[PDB]
Amino acid sequence: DQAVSKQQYADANAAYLQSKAAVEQARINLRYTKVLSPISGRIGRSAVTEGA
Amino acid sequence: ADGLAARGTFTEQLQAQRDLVKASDEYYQLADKRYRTGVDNYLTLLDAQRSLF
């Protein structure tokens, strides 16, 4: 409807993608918890235990 | 005598108001340039048309 500008939509879309990138940072930083296996194979000892 | 006074100084009012209309017209032209470029929204162009009218 051109009730807003193109610039005050462009910076809002930029802030949308920046906040999406910050949520992606938080999601990978939560995926770093519950540590996933890097490669498939045979596992050794649990050198750390529960609570340590 | 009052009509001679009006003919003596209404030119220096009509030229001033015509310069005001020309200045507001080129103000609206610059606001339309800002709008068609995309910097300001349509409501500021409507404010420019309000002032020009």
UniProtKB/Swiss-Prot annotation, chain A:
Compartment(s) where it occurs, according to its Swiss-Prot or TrEMBL record: Cell inner membrane
Effect of a null allele: Disruption of MexA, MexB and OprM significantly reduces active efflux of N-(3-oxododecanoyl) homoserine lactone/3-oxo-C12-HSL/PAI-1, but not N-butyryl homoserine lactone/C4-HSL/PAI-2.
Origin superkingdom: Bacteria
Record's note on what induces expression: By growth under severe iron limitation.
Misc. remarks from the entry: In both X-ray crystal structures approximately the last 100 residues are not ordered.
Record function comment: The periplasmic linker component of the MexAB-OprM efflux system that confers multidrug resistance. Functions as the major efflux pump for n-hexane and p-xylene efflux. Has been shown in one study to be involved in the active efflux of the autoinducer N-(3-oxododecanoyl) homoserine lactone, thereby playing an indirect role in quorum-sensing; but has been shown in another study not to be involved in efflux of this autoinducer. Over-expression of the pump increases antibiotic and solvent efflux capacities. Implicated in the secretion of the siderophore pyoverdine.
Record-stated family: Belongs to the membrane fusion protein (MFP) (TC 8.A.1) family.
Oligomeric form and interacting partners: Component of the MexAB-OprM multidrug efflux complex, composed of six MexA subunits forming a hexameric tube, binding to a MexB trimer, which interact with the trimeric OprM outer membrane channel protein. OprM is thought to not directly contact MexB; instead, MexA joins MexB and OprM by forming a funnel-like hexamer anchored to the inner membrane. MexA may initially form a hexameric ring complex with MexB prior to OprM, then OprM undergoes a conformational change as it contacts MexA, allowing the periplasmic gate to open.
Protein name, entry field: Multidrug resistance protein MexA
Gene symbol of the encoding locus: mexA
Residues of the full protein shown: 126 to 177 of 383
UniProtKB/Swiss-Prot annotation, chain B:
Result of altering G38A: Abolishes complex formation
Location in or out of the cell: Cell outer membrane
Induction of its expression: By growth under severe iron limitation.
Disulfide partners: none
Phenotype when the gene is knocked out: Disruption of MexA, MexB and OprM significantly reduces active efflux of N-(3-oxododecanoyl) homoserine lactone/3-oxo-C12-HSL/PAI-1, but not N-butyryl homoserine lactone/C4-HSL/PAI-2.
Subunit structure: Component of the MexAB-OprM multidrug efflux complex, composed of six MexA subunits forming a hexameric tube, binding to a MexB trimer, which interact with the trimeric OprM outer membrane channel protein. The OprM homotrimer forms a 135 Angstroms-long pore. It consists of a beta-barrel, which is probably inserted in the outer membrane, and an alpha-barrel formed by alpha-helices which probably spans the periplasm. In the ground state the periplasmic end is closed, while the outer membrane end opening is 6-8 Angstroms in diameter.
Family: Belongs to the outer membrane factor (OMF) (TC 1.B.17) family.
Task performed by this protein: The outer membrane component of the MexAB-OprM efflux system that confers multidrug resistance. Functions as the major efflux pump for n-hexane and p-xylene efflux. Has been shown in one study to be involved in the active efflux of the autoinducer N-(3-oxododecanoyl) homoserine lactone, thereby playing an indirect role in quorum-sensing; but has been shown in another study not to be involved in efflux of this autoinducer. Over-expression of the pump increases antibiotic and solvent efflux capacities.
Protein name: Outer membrane protein OprM
Organism: Pseudomonas aeruginosa (strain ATCC 15692 / DSM 22644 / CIP 104116 / JCM 14847 / LMG 12228 / 1C / PRS 101 / PAO1)
UniProt gene name: oprM
